């Protein structure tokens, strides 16, 4: 045995292309549409819960994941690749930051750590790149609210609003017309739901849509009282009912 693939599986072609990264992006293109919109007092990330079977309980499959109390993530592409990246992202937030500084990492630096992991799968021996693009939304004290995209290459970019996957080209055009620097969080959620409807074929409701926000601190979700400085997580996943309420004002 032993891993005898100690050589790179991603290499430069004569034209300068890194084939495996391009193909990973093609897998992302086939993926279900997900989007992110940044408001003045929050960020929203959303996607479609494309249920593989009606017998499957799609609530048990989380496409939108909490990384830290103030950071959340969504993806387009290969689900299993996303799931393991979320596990690594959660751990690296502790091992390379919280266990050192006693606080959670700022959005940009966690994004940087996730990006590094994805970059290494592009160069290290005997592995393929991750077949996902990530959208990471978050808040921290000194940078405020932010939204980042991370690609299979390990490249990341900050966005005011964007979309990835299936209908991203049409969705990004839709977002360009609607976005301004004066949006409140509820306005961004409204625009998110409008944008997402265009790329969804079948049912469009709180059970088929996954949506989370980075907004105000939620002391009700903290689990304890007594420490004034601890005010609770800013990441909150919207319920099926909360989504449907906003679909009537749509």
């Amino acid at each position: 045995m032993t891993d005898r693939y100690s050589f790179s599986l991603t290499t430069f072609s004569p034209s300068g292309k890194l084939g495996q990264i391009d193909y990973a992006l093609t897998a992302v293109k086939q993926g279900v549409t997900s989007l992110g919109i940044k408001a003045t007092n929050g960020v929203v990330i959303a996607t479609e819960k494309k249920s593989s079977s009606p017998l499957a309980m799609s609530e048990t499959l989380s496409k939108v994941s909490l990384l830290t109390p103030d950071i959340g993530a969504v993806y387009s592409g290969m689900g299993p690749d996303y799931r393991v990246l979320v596990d690594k992202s959660r751990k690296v937030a502790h091992t390379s930051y919280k266990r050192i500084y006693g606080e959670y990492p700022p959005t940009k630096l966690l994004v940087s750590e996730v990006a590094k992991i994805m970059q290494e799968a592009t160069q290290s021996g005997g592995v393929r790149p991750f077949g996902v693009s990530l959208l990471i939304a978050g808040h921290d004290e000194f940078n405020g609210f932010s939204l980042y995209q991370v690609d299979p290459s390990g490249s990341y970019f900050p966005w005011k609003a964007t979309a990835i996957g299936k209908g991203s080209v049409a969705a990004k055009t839709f977002l360009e017309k609607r976005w301004n620097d004066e949006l409140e969080l509820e306005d961004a959620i409204h625009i998110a739901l409008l944008t997402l409807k265009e790329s969804v074929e079948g049912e469009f409701n709180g059970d088929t849509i996954e949506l989370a926000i980075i907004g105000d601190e939620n002391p009700d979700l903290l689990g304890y009282t007594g420490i004034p400085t601890d005010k609770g997580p800013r990441f909150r996943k919207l319920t099926s009912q909360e989504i449907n309420d906003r679909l009537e004002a749509l």
């Binding site: 897998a27 499959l61 393929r128 790149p129 077949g131």
Partner: protein, 241 residues
Amino acid sequence: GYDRHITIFSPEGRLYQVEYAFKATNQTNINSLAVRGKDCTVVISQKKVPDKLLDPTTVSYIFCISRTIGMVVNGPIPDARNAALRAKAEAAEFRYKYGYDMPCDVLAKRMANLSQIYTQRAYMRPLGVILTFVSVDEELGPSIYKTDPAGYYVGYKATATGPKQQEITTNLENHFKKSKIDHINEESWEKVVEFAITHMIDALGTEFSKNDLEVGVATKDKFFTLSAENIEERLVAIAEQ
């Protein structure tokens, strides 16, 4: 065309070795079914002993992973036992480290992560098996979580696996469309097993003797498999109404 030999992306963004591992899954020509009751989770699987020289008691694709968790496998037996041994080791380790029994969904996720690794690392091949984990979880209640060679997993109200999964799946879909509930509204596991066998008969259009089936049952604090005589008692009750 070495992108078809190892787990790297094709130009279409596909992993052919994963797709071919899904095809190996049906090599045994066996169909399995899982459903949930009020207090139990039942899994049934076809049993085929084509050789008379075989000891039929040793021919099985249902595994007792832990006291609480059971696992049925769709695929070749060598890969099935590979997955079974690992799942048992993982469940035992979990209990030692964290002081409580490994949940069914957590074990499924763990095995799904291990599968995901085989789809990304070139030196390891995927296992040509689909794993259906069942239990009565102390927090979530009756649970069905299924894993495949892609590293995908999800919870199910009910599920089916094998060459004729579609026929069974649609049959199950139609029943739950009528009842409008996420489980079989029945008190005893015996009747949930009877439901499972009845709907497999309807879907496949074949009759079963006691040696044509294999049954696993999960209750609170234990998973167990039924003997041929236990199954016979089930088959008699089905025929008598």
